């Protein structure tokens, strides 16, 4: 129950796995979080972080905390390319990179088949799950990345149900990017199933977090 010290990062950078940030992967509980709220190592690929302030309060004090690989990188995606999702927006160690806890999936060859992946919570604890939705800047990039022009993403659980459509548009350059990526989180209750369907534009979880919370 020592504090969780994020260093130069803020909660968004840590929890997403911004390569600038320590994983702190052995931290299994904390009394409070010591943070740099104004850090630029929250989100490196520009976009909205939905309900961020709620997530800060959720994570403020935990009595049990376990990162686990909900969707293992090397085997969960046999029909999609999980090895190209790096970007100049997220540079690390002199090279293009991306978040530790998410995988930006693109097409395998020239076909992006219908993805459908499920996780059933057997942890006996609320499971924190984060994912991203990517919005290209042009119709050209939409096909280069995902082939399917009319892609969609669906995320569903006992508490959450939403279909995403890619919003293609040229936006002012942020971190030299004209597209965007929006970041989402939700808790999956003990025993519930969360389903990811997508024909494009989906930034899949790699790591999730089983958590119990410190309240009194």
């Amino acid at each position, epitope marked *: 129950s020592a504090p969780l010290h994020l260093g130069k990062c803020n909660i968004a950078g840590w929890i997403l796995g911004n390569p600038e940030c320590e994983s702190l992967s052995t931290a299994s509980s904390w009394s409070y979080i010591v943070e740099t709220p104004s850090s630029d190592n929250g989100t490196c690929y520009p*976009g*909205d972080f939905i309900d961020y302030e709620e997530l800060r309060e959720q994570l403020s004090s935990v009595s049990s905390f376990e990162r686990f690989e909900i969707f293992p990188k090397t085997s969960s995606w046999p029909n999609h390319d999980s090895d190209k999702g790096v970007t100049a927006a997220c540079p690390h160690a002199g090279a293009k990179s991306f978040y530790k806890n998410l995988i930006w999936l693109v097409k395998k060859g020239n076909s992006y088949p219908k993805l459908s992946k499920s996780y059933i919570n057997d942890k006996g604890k609320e499971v924190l799950v984060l994912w991203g939705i990517h919005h290209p800047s042009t119709s050209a990039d939409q096909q280069s990345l995902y082939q399917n022009a009319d892609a969609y993403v669906f995320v569903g659980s006992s508490r959450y149900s939403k279909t995403f459509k890619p919003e*293609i548009a040229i936006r002012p350059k942020v971190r030299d990017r004209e597209g965007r990526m929006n970041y989402y989180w939700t808790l999956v209750e003990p025993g519930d199933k969360i389903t990811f369907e997508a024909t494009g534009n989906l930034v899949v979880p790699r790591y999730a977090f089983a958590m119990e919370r410190n309240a009194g």
Partner: antibody, heavy 129, light 109 residues
Framework: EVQLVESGGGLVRPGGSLTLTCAGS????????MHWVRQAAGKGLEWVAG???????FYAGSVKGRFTISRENARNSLYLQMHSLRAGDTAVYYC???????????????????????WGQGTTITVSG | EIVLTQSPGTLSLSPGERATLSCRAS???????LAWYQQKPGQAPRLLIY???NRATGIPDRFSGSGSGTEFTLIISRLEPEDLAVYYC?????????FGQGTRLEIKR
């Protein structure tokens, strides 16, 4: 080509109704906020109504309760239904698109508006008997 | 409830001179919500500046926006006969958009 075309303007009695349509092309309609802006002959620009991507609506105080803005992204179409029309509603009505955005930056969610970007040619409404 | 008073009402200047247009807000306004527009005769408005100081795409270098608080300025460094138009400033506030009354830029000959 990125384009906007208004239609449906014309002559209407005072106290009557009229529905304007704005069709877009060359661009993904659901990505943008959509707006109506009217200009009376020889006068300035007047924002009347706007709508977000997800469908929430905004209105100028001078038209609240009488104009209703709606969009159908599947038809790339903006609509402005008008009733209780008064003489002071006569103007050319423009259609315009705009980008708004929340960016997570420095640990907070920051809202941005990047201006009304593409404008239509305008359609004219005349309210008299 | 935000008013933009724009001055001068009419601006007569010769080609090559510098045009300074002012937009005054009845109340302090966040830079990112101020925009500027160009309406040449017989045409639809054209966006020039977004967020007070950033040029819209395709807008030449001679158009520059600046300012903060309640005082905002558009500047056209080297006037040309094509710059003849009415210039409007715009602001977003309280989920409502309002324009200024406009500035006739008149080309001296």
């Amino acid at each position: 080509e990125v384009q906007l075309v208004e239609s449906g303007g014309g002559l209407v009695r005072p106290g009557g109704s009229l529905t304007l349509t704005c069709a877009g092309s060359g661009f993904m309609f659901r990505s943008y906020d959509m707006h109506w802006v009217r200009q009376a002959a020889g006068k300035g620009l007047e924002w009347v109504a706007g709508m977000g991507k997800g469908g929430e609506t905004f209105y100028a105080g001078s038209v609240k309760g009488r104009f209703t803005i709606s969009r159908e992204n599947a038809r790339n179409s903006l609509y402005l239904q008008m009733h209780s029309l008064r003489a002071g509603d006569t103007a050319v009505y423009y259609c315009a698109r705009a980008l708004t955005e929340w960016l997570f930056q420095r640990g907070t969610r920051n809202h941005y508006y990047y201006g009304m970007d593409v404008w239509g040619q305008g359609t004219t409404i005349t309210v008299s008997g | 409830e935000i008013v933009l008073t724009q001055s001068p009402g009419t601006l007569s200047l010769s080609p090559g001179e510098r045009a300074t247009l002012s937009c005054r807000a009845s109340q302090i306004i966040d830079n990112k919500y101020l925009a500027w527009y160009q309406q040449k005769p017989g045409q639809a408005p054209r966006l020039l500046i977004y967020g007070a100081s950033n040029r819209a795409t395709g807008i030449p270098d001679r158009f520059s926006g600046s300012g903060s608080g309640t005082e905002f300025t558009l500047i056209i460094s080297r006037l040309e006969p094509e710059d003849l138009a009415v210039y409007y400033c715009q602001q977003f506030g309280s989920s409502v958009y309002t324009f200024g009354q406009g500035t006739r830029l008149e080309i001296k000959r």
